Design an enzyme around this catalytic site. Structure first.
Site, mmCIF file in Angstrom:
data_model
loop_
_atom_site.group_PDB
_atom_site.id
_atom_site.type_symbol
_atom_site.label_atom_id
_atom_site.label_comp_id
_atom_site.label_asym_id
_atom_site.label_seq_id
_atom_site.Cartn_x
_atom_site.Cartn_y
_atom_site.Cartn_z
ATOM 1 N N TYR B 508 6.652 7.133 11.517
ATOM 2 C CA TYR B 508 5.932 6.493 10.431
ATOM 3 C C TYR B 508 6.475 4.968 10.550
ATOM 4 O O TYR B 508 5.377 4.267 10.546
ATOM 5 C CB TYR B 508 6.731 7.183 9.164
ATOM 6 C CG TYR B 508 5.964 6.391 7.678
ATOM 7 C CD1 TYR B 508 6.827 5.407 7.005
ATOM 8 C CD2 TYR B 508 4.793 6.866 7.263
ATOM 9 C CE1 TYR B 508 6.535 4.938 5.831
ATOM 10 C CE2 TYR B 508 4.177 6.246 5.946
ATOM 11 C CZ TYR B 508 5.248 5.136 5.376
ATOM 12 O OH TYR B 508 4.384 4.720 4.147
ATOM 13 N N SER B 591 -0.729 7.923 7.397
ATOM 14 C CA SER B 591 -0.732 6.562 6.782
ATOM 15 C C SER B 591 -0.079 5.241 7.561
ATOM 16 O O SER B 591 -0.834 5.033 8.748
ATOM 17 C CB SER B 591 0.225 6.734 5.464
ATOM 18 O OG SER B 591 0.282 5.536 4.732
ATOM 19 N N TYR B 592 0.792 4.781 7.188
ATOM 20 C CA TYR B 592 1.500 3.717 8.209
ATOM 21 C C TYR B 592 1.809 4.080 9.545
ATOM 22 O O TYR B 592 1.807 3.695 10.445
ATOM 23 C CB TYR B 592 2.669 3.138 7.532
ATOM 24 C CG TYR B 592 3.109 1.856 8.228
ATOM 25 C CD1 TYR B 592 2.909 0.491 7.242
ATOM 26 C CD2 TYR B 592 3.938 1.662 9.437
ATOM 27 C CE1 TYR B 592 3.391 -0.758 8.022
ATOM 28 C CE2 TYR B 592 4.098 0.643 10.112
ATOM 29 C CZ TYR B 592 3.803 -0.565 9.392
ATOM 30 O OH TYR B 592 4.322 -1.743 10.076
ATOM 31 N N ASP B 669 -10.622 8.601 0.424
ATOM 32 C CA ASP B 669 -9.214 8.050 0.264
ATOM 33 C C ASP B 669 -9.197 6.783 -0.174
ATOM 34 O O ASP B 669 -9.573 5.714 0.053
ATOM 35 C CB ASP B 669 -8.635 7.713 1.903
ATOM 36 C CG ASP B 669 -7.407 7.388 2.229
ATOM 37 O OD1 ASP B 669 -6.783 7.887 3.250
ATOM 38 O OD2 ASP B 669 -6.671 7.135 1.070
ATOM 39 N N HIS B 701 -6.078 10.237 0.191
ATOM 40 C CA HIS B 701 -4.959 9.896 1.311
ATOM 41 C C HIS B 701 -3.899 10.806 1.474
ATOM 42 O O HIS B 701 -3.473 10.940 2.684
ATOM 43 C CB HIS B 701 -4.048 8.661 0.842
ATOM 44 C CG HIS B 701 -3.514 7.924 1.727
ATOM 45 N ND1 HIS B 701 -3.816 7.637 3.077
ATOM 46 C CD2 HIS B 701 -2.276 7.438 1.828
ATOM 47 C CE1 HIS B 701 -3.075 7.165 3.712
ATOM 48 N NE2 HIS B 701 -2.085 7.025 3.111
HETATM 49 C C1 LIG Z 1 7.256 7.781 -0.711
HETATM 50 C C2 LIG Z 1 5.942 7.557 -1.340
HETATM 51 C C3 LIG Z 1 5.462 8.873 -1.944
HETATM 52 C C4 LIG Z 1 4.820 7.412 -0.153
HETATM 53 O O1 LIG Z 1 5.461 6.451 -2.164
HETATM 54 C C5 LIG Z 1 6.698 5.454 -1.934
HETATM 55 C C6 LIG Z 1 5.939 4.218 -2.717
HETATM 56 C C7 LIG Z 1 6.725 3.924 -4.007
HETATM 57 O O2 LIG Z 1 6.346 4.092 -4.950
HETATM 58 N N1 LIG Z 1 8.100 3.544 -3.548
HETATM 59 C C8 LIG Z 1 8.764 3.309 -2.410
HETATM 60 C C9 LIG Z 1 7.607 2.758 -1.368
HETATM 61 N N2 LIG Z 1 6.205 3.198 -1.698
HETATM 62 C C10 LIG Z 1 5.132 2.486 -0.981
HETATM 63 O O3 LIG Z 1 5.346 1.560 -0.079
HETATM 64 C C11 LIG Z 1 3.593 2.818 -1.137
HETATM 65 C C12 LIG Z 1 3.075 2.523 -0.003
HETATM 66 N N3 LIG Z 1 1.651 1.886 -0.246
HETATM 67 C C13 LIG Z 1 2.753 3.717 1.252
HETATM 68 C C14 LIG Z 1 1.695 3.154 2.156
HETATM 69 C C15 LIG Z 1 1.777 2.528 3.131
HETATM 70 C C16 LIG Z 1 0.771 2.117 4.146
HETATM 71 F F1 LIG Z 1 1.096 1.321 4.903
HETATM 72 C C17 LIG Z 1 -0.339 2.614 3.921
HETATM 73 F F2 LIG Z 1 -1.387 2.404 4.802
HETATM 74 C C18 LIG Z 1 -0.456 3.647 2.957
HETATM 75 C C19 LIG Z 1 0.234 3.841 1.911
HETATM 76 F F3 LIG Z 1 0.037 4.727 0.901
#
Ligand SMILES: CC(C)(C)OC[C@H]1C(=O)NCCN1C(=O)C[C@H](N)Cc1cc(F)c(F)cc1F
Ligand SMILES: CC(C)(C)OC[C@H]1C(=O)NCCN1C(=O)C[C@H](N)Cc1cc(F)c(F)cc1F
Lengths: 727, 725
Positions: B508, B591-592, B669, B701
């Site tokens: 990830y 995702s990432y 998505d 997504h």
């Molecule tokens: C743990 C999960 C349930 C994933 O949500 C954590 C969410 C939060 O609410 N608190 C901690 C950090 N966090 C985020 O950073 C959301 C991001 N956008 C996730 C993301 C990164 C990408 F690079 C991408 F391409 C698509 C994505 F969806």
């Protein structure tokens, strides 16, 4: 000793030489040699330079195509060509004066012009810009606006909407100059209540936000666009003020319900014929209207109406035939289905209701090519009773028993498929042979039909193919229920029926289609047979055309039945011939062929191991109305709704567990929308069957992008080779 | 002696049992027993029935969730649930009077309600309908309309727009009650000039025409939504005149340009704390606003501000941490990075700029869980210096040297990863053990840390797992530039280090992410190791979190570089371990993780034979602004446009000729738009690279549909098995 490789097909190593000419008179035509526009004299073959190849390298733009005015005083150059649909496109235009050897800079043709067309004579000009019609008497003087209702995606003037371009007129243009350019007849389409098909267009990666393309698209049973017809006198545009466009309405038998305008054909300088079609495409009416000298109006006498209906299906092949009027415009010849179900030429009187057939037999006339005071030239498949052959015949008007074939015996071994291009008054004609041998082009004189010379014989290509292991082509038939059904096979080189080869069933099987013919081709099937030793078979079953209405109307209101079952039965027939590996039989198809292939793979027949479906139709309620309703009627409970739902590929998702399935579709497919394949995959997922998939970003129904085209056939080649275990 | 098969993972044959409870008081909590809901006395464990299952089996609708009022006199029922984004959803509601023993049939909550919430005390009610806030002082009384500017896709009152829901508040709700329900603070978001992302939705087969979903979505560098904050007194709602909301404006250091509202926390009954974040997310200011009796406004004195900035990257892990105020609201504790880059708890004073750290060391406090007069309850990864571990600690507020770990020694074999749930006043607390052993739930008392009873031990699941060849898990580290970087390996059963196995890299590698922990998991990796005998490994390189800013901020402004290269370097050292077949190494991510997987397969390292990318990023100018600009700045020539263009996967399409590639993405998505995968495929076509592809209709997504979930992991399994032969 080499084979015909996939690279040879993708890189286009072996090119079929052509000879595209443009008749400018009754004895002269134009042709491009070294990018120089040459003018030829058909009588003696000598030519002269009409436009040097360096004349427009100072232009600054890459010219896509040219268009010389009939009088030879000007030439329209179009550049910045950007394709839209099958026939429509957008580009820039410039006029080059040949009497001054200069570009027109004053009153240039506006940018974003949707369609340009010269007058049949002289150098008048009519073009469509922003859905409105303009007319220029002189290429450098200001234009005269004809229509004012032109509105984007709502009102079309001089141009067709999506359905009419694709399924009715087969062209973007909705303009029709009178024979000598006096009148300009045009149609107006109104897509106000027509629903919009919407899909994403991503464009170059620099575009941050995807683009949403919205096109008025009448799906099956949806609200169709309305149409109106007009005729304007361009000679009155001098003292124009606001020139009056006279409207010609449809007959009362069409105003009672939804209808179409399916043909526009001028007969004389003051006589135009219009054919109208009901939404239930089994009843069409031709209307012949004369110009009233004093009233300035157009009148269509009921006595000159002509009704062409069908009791066992739709009327015509894909549309009611077009009429071919005599010189005086008081009679015309037209292709219609006879009492035996075979389409032949009938002689109509402009006044009498009954017509007289001049041709007959268990065969059909493909099209009328030329009409003189003496003879009428047509194309048919009568020779040797081969529905897949094309020859040019000449029937004597003063005695219908005097019929002579002009191409049957020119070269019976090398040439069995012909098209023709006549001169202005049918004085000369170029014969185009396209199989079973290499293409052959010849010029002829209509006085005695003698062969003047050979324009192109592909002698250069013939030499290259000598040291290449080319496949062979067998054209034959089988008998199913006392009926000949023709098929063709691309047999691998050194074919040996002592062995057993893999079989790939190339399928289209659309209504009034033909996959088994005498045409020579260099395509993906050539590679699969030459290099991979795969028999690529094609079968014309029920629903195919050029064989009589009994076969063509067999799938009427019943798409996805006999057409599909005939393809499965054909596979059983091939395996029972001895040289077919029963455990290695595949099937693939594009567009309609993708739909048939998907229905086959989901039939549970167990005949096929794998299959590829490129841009397939899933359910017919997703496709346009004019095409679908023509063969399936309306998707209402009181009508054919029961088969609209009974002939979906989604309803066969469970059976796909028995086959290997590859689904391909372009994300920008305006014809068969990506929605169709999106529903196929989602149905397969709901019942949990695995399959292979491949989308192509911003590719349309053809997937004709140079890179996408090479990528799809490369991807399909691997899928076929692995399914057959071919290394 | 059967193995953990793919069917087991896709059918949930072996399910982890949990003990999800909700504290109703300082010594009681609610717990659902399949049919009904019970009330447990934390001190003794005896339980009475609170609500029977037959109370709403005559309802006519399916109960989706329950919400008891803080005073236990009403119960809010959720039905007609319709999911939107990660947190947002619409639903219908019905209040059930516990005194009248029947539903309220007058002045009911409208259908298509976007958010509902009781007051902290009593039974007030604030909900959002059509982007406007309504408040009921009593359930069966008319509701006062606080806002009238609510407009779909433009004005949001009490709810967050897409980018705020995903990247800022992690919730649909933009409401914040005061401690006793007197004031109701809320935020207003304006997406007037925010561009909308458009993608087709095909819906059921019956739909003749596809629909076009349009969502206000600010991509990198685009116009962001503006935000306003308001506070309204809910004890004086006039039934005749409209409610008058008092607006709190952001500091001048934030009004100079684009900014965000990133935290809202109430201190006292008349004091609320706000935290603002500049669009360049390395500078944040906390306001502490007190209510003025006579003035009727809210004043945030300048001397009470608190700046939190960063010179090496962004401020906070994903956003500035939330404060925890004392009883008088005159001081608070919060997590901030010290001057060496390690995040610890700092003791603040409302009127003082400097704070004093109460924790130190080369480790980080994961979060503050509870605050009392004498103790601060936090979680950290200090135990045994394992960044992948979680333990609960208590630190005496009167003596920072008296620190105690409450979970370290409970069960060191089974439990190295803890989360906690304290009672109303932190009198009791439930510990949630997550690994490396099976989950364990226990109850404790704060007075002496006694440990009252065992709630759930998964003993029934442990008994079944003894009949299946389950895989093991190895947690270790490797050295890169004299730095410890941790990794984990899901080892097949009967693992022999003299035998060579195929290795799959589960990646990830998002900023402040962690894939090498002690959490026990039953996932697709469990099947790949147990049945297919595949070593699935995860590695936390530069950019991972919970190890200091030196590691986390290493990828600042350089996304797609170090975290991508370190994945390659780790896999290189994995290949030369003797038990890893260097000719059969794959990499997959979501995702990432799909972006890193795509950047790795296109790196030209030749280490990997195949790879799978699921809903990946391909061009950071395609993703939303708050997340992307937090690590990449603006896509402008004078800022960081250079790396926005260098870190695309399309630019590496040429190097995909030597790898097998499976690209998967859902058509619906809304997070990582299908556009990103459409540009990857189009780039591979332009260079003539063959690859595998697979779209999923109407999936988002998560691709979490029952049938789609099974279909993708089945399709990915065949791909991996074929690539490993
Ligand atoms: C743990 C999960 C349930 C994933 O949500 C954590 C969410 C939060 O609410 N608190 C901690 C950090 N966090 C985020 O950073 C959301 C991001 N956008 C996730 C993301 C990164 C990408 F690079 C991408 F391409 C698509 C994505 F969806
Ligand atoms: C030159 C070709 C390609 C043969 O088209 C010619 C066109 C024409 O202009 N005149 C004769 C016939 N004709 C048509 O029938 C167009 C149809 N829409 C083809 C079609 C059928 C489907 F079932 C489908 F799913 C998608 C399709 F595109």
């Amino acid at each position: 000793r080499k084979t015909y490789t996939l690279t040879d097909y993708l890189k286009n190593t072996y090119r079929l030489k052509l000879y595209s000419l443009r008749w400018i008179s009754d004895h002269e035509y134009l042709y491009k040699q070294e990018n120089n526009i040459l003018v030829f004299n058909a009588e003696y073959g000598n030519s002269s330079v009409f436009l040097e190849n360096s004349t427009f390298d100072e232009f600054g733009h890459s010219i896509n195509d040219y268009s010389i005015s009939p009088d030879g005083q000007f030439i329209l150059l179009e550049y910045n060509y950007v394709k839209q649909w099958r026939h429509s496109y957008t580009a820039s235009y410039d006029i080059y004066d040949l009497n001054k050897r200069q570009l027109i800079t004053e009153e240039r043709i506006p940018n974003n012009t949707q369609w340009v067309t010269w007058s049949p004579v002289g150098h008048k000009l009519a073009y469509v810009w922003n859905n409105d019609i303009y007319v220029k008497i002189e290429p450098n003087l200001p234009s005269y606006r004809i229509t004012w209702t032109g509105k984007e995606d709502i009102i079309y003037n001089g141009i067709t909407d999506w359905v009419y371009e694709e399924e009715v007129f087969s062209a973007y243009s909705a303009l029709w100059w009178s024979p000598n350019g006096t009148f300009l007849a045009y149609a107006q389409f109104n897509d106000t209540e027509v629903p919009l098909i919407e899909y994403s267009f991503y464009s170059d990666e620099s575009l941050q936000y995807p683009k949403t393309v919205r096109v008025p698209y009448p799906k099956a049973g949806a609200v169709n666009p309305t149409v109106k017809f007009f005729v304007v006198n361009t000679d009155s545009l001098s003292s124009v003020t606001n020139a009056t466009s006279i409207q010609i309405t449809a007959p009362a038998s069409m105003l009672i319900g939804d209808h179409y305008l399916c043909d526009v054909t001028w007969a004389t300088q003051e006589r135009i014929s219009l054919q109208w079609l009901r939404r239930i495409q089994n009843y069409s009416v031709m209307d012949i209207c004369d110009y009233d000298e004093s009233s300035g109006r157009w009148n269509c006498l009921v006595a000159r109406q002509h009704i062409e209906m069908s009791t066992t299906g739709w009327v015509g092949r894909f549309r009611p035939s077009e009429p071919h009027f005599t010189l005086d415009g008081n009679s015309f010849y037209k292709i219609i289905s006879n009492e035996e179900g075979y389409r032949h030429i009938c002689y109509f009187q402009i006044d009498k209701k009954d017509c007289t057939f001049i041709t007959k037999g268990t065969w059909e006339v493909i099209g009328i090519e030329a009409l003189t005071s003496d003879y009428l030239y047509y194309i048919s498949n009568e020779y040797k009773g081969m529905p897949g052959g094309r020859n040019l015949y000449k029937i004597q008007l003063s005695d219908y028993t005097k019929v002579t074939c002009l191409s049957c015996e020119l070269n019976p071994e090398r040439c069995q498929y012909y098209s023709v291009s006549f001169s202005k008054e049918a004085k000369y004609y170029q014969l185009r042979c396209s199989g079973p041998g290499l293409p052959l082009y010849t010029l002829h004189s209509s006085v005695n039909d003698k062969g003047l010379r050979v324009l192109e014989d592909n002698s250069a290509l013939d030499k290259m193919l000598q040291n290449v292991q080319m496949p062979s082509k067998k054209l034959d038939f089988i008998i199913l229920n006392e009926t000949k059904f023709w098929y063709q096979m691309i047999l691998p080189p050194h074919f040996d029926k002592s062995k057993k080869y893999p079989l790939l069933l190339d399928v289209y099987a659309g209504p009034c289609s033909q996959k088994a013919d005498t045409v020579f081709r260099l395509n993906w099937a050539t590679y699969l047979a030459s290099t991979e030793n795969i028999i690529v078979a094609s079968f014309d079953g029920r629903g195919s055309g050029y064989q009589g209405d009994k076969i063509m109307h067999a799938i009427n209101r019943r798409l996805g039945t006999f057409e599909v079952e005939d393809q499965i039965e054909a596979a059983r027939q091939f395996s029972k011939m001895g040289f077919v590996d029963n455990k290695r039989i595949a099937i693939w198809g594009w567009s309609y062929g993708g739909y048939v292939t998907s229905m086959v793979l989901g039939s549970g027949s167990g005949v096929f191991k794998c299959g590829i479906a490129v841009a397939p139709v899933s359910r017919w309620e997703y496709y346009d109305s004019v095409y679908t309703e023509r063969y399936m009627g309306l998707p209402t409970p009181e009508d054919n709704l029961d088969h609209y739902r009974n002939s979906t590929v989604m309803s066969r998702a469970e059976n796909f567990k028995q086959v290997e399935y590859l689904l391909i579709h372009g994300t920008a497919d305006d014809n068969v929308h990506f929605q169709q394949s999106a529903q196929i995959s989602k149905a397969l997922v709901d019942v949990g069957v695995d399959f292979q998939a491949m989308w192509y970003t911003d590719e349309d129904h053809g997937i004709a992008s140079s890179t996408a085209h090479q990528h799809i056939y490369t991807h399909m080649s691997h899928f076929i080779k692995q399914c057959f275990s071919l290394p």
